[PDB]
Amino acid sequence: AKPLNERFFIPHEIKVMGRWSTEDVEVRDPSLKPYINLEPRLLPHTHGRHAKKHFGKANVHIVERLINKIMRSGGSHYKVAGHFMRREHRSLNSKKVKAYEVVKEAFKIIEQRTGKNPIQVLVWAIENAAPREDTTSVMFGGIRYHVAVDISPMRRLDVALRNIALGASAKCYRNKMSFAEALAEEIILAANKDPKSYAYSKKLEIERIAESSR
């Protein structure tokens, strides 16, 4: 509770989620520079409406993009503080509101071990979790090919973050890996390109199957 208020004096100044300065990191590649909202500021929730335009989804705070592809899995059933759930899932059968907590605690659990600005470990995990080449079963002229298709910087990011957010929910499954943890131990190891990231195992295979086919 007192640290919590220090976390209210500190984001003010300016810093993400209470104590992560948005200047600590830089986007070194000139590819992922206009596609990423590292540079702008303070809160993800924002509600700034996206997909409004052609690229009304590139200007989305990196973390907000995280929150709602981390929020994804969800039907019908009913949640409230009662007895009451699940209904908000292994990935928010429900809101970005109790989602934003998970990503905050995962920034807390990835800061606790690495000790770096965690927005330097995640932006280092969404330039590596994206495959550089993909095969589409594309036919053109009635002729069925399985072809060299190179990936665009916007469709990169998306496959980076989504594969990060798809890998964690196989592990969190009825397991001590809490998403605040299971995400925080995915984001470190996608930053590293480690052999333990279900998100850097598809990145590779999607380039390697796509190299054969070309």
Partner: protein
């Protein structure tokens, strides 16, 4: 002193704000800015107040009453109005253009709010049909 009354409206949280000179008062629905439990939607309110400076925050009394359902809803109605309360105060295009370049959720609301639940073909929600399996 002065009285400049403004408004700030996002997704039907209507913020009633007043900006008069004083000593650093932040009042929300009668309670200091301290009473809120989410740290998060607080920082949102706090965004404009640093973009201008603590200098003008300390020298001016801000009382707002945000009658709006959302926790983030209240905050958002508070983010739009302080920013408009501070641009009427000093008067310059420096503080207005500095807000617009950062985000348009400080000085534009929405054009839209909510849609009705359509009659539909006997199911739940505006945009949904009964499931089929008769093929």
């Amino acid at each position: 002193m002065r009285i400049i009354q403004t408004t700030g409206k996002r997704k039907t949280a209507i913020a009633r704000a007043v900006i008069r000179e004083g000593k650093g008062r932040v009042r929300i629905n009668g309670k200091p800015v301290e009473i809120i439990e989410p740290e998060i939607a607080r920082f949102t309110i706090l965004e404009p107040l640093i973009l201008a400076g603590e200098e003008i925050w300390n020298s001016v009394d801000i009382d707002v009453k945000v009658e709006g359902g959302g926790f983030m809803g209240q905050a958002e109605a508070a983010r739009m109005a302080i920013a408009r309360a501070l641009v009427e105060w000093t008067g310059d295009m420096s503080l207005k253009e500095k807000f617009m370049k950062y985000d348009r959720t400080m000085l534009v609301g929405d054009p839209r709010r909510t849609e009705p639940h359509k009659p539909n073909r006997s199911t739940k929600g505006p945009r949904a049909k009964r499931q089929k399996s008769y093929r």
